[PDB]
Amino acid sequence: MQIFVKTLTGKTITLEVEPSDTIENVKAKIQDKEGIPPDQQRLIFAGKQLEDGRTLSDYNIQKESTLHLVLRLRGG
Amino acid sequence: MQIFVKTLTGKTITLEVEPSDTIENVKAKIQDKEGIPPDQQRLIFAGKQLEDGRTLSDYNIQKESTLHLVLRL
Numbered sequence: 001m002q003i004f005v006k007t008l009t010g011k012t013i014t015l016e017v018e019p020s021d022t023i024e025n026v027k028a029k030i031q032d033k034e035g036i037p038p039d040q041q042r043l044i045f046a047g048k049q050l051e052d053g054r055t056l057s058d059y060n061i062q063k064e065s066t067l068h069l070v071l072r073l074r075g076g
Numbered sequence: 077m078q079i080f081v082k083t084l085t086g087k088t089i090t091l092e093v094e095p096s097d098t099i100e101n102v103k104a105k106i107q108d109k110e111g112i113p114p115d116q117q118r119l120i121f122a123g124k125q126l127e128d129g130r131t132l133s134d135y136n137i138q139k140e141s142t143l144h145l146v147l148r149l
Contacts, residue, residue, distance in 0.1 A: 038125075076135055
């Protein structure tokens with residue numbers, strides 16, 4: 001399935017992902033696209049921050065959902 | 077230096093580490109104590125997951141810091 005990520009400049013990227021993908025798996029994909037290490041990413045969906053050990057489906061993230069990338073400011 | 081680890085049962089144990097120890101090195105020490113393989117460990121400090129590759133110092137982890145052990149499911 002396709003999802004969207006809104007990046008640090010408010011651009012929208014598209015990733016191919018599976019419902020069973022964990023949030024750390026999604027971070028890694030964002031790293032390849034955006035050059036932001038996973039321990040420096042916060043991922044927001046529908047206004048809430050997502051935990052690393054959960055799947056996308058655990059959060060009811062579906063086809064064409066949008067995640068928001070936010071840069072950690074205080075360090076890894 | 078002495079760090080703490082909160083285990084899967086919620087009990088705290090102590091590890092002897094140095095600040096230049098990497099996270100993968102801390103995972104090893106945890107495997108010795110707890111019998112969890114490193115590739116089945118997620119380690120949390122201050123509400124965030126720690127990357128393999130980085131040192132403890134990289135994360136400003138100090139003496140009496142508590143890391144949280146979480147089993148990958």
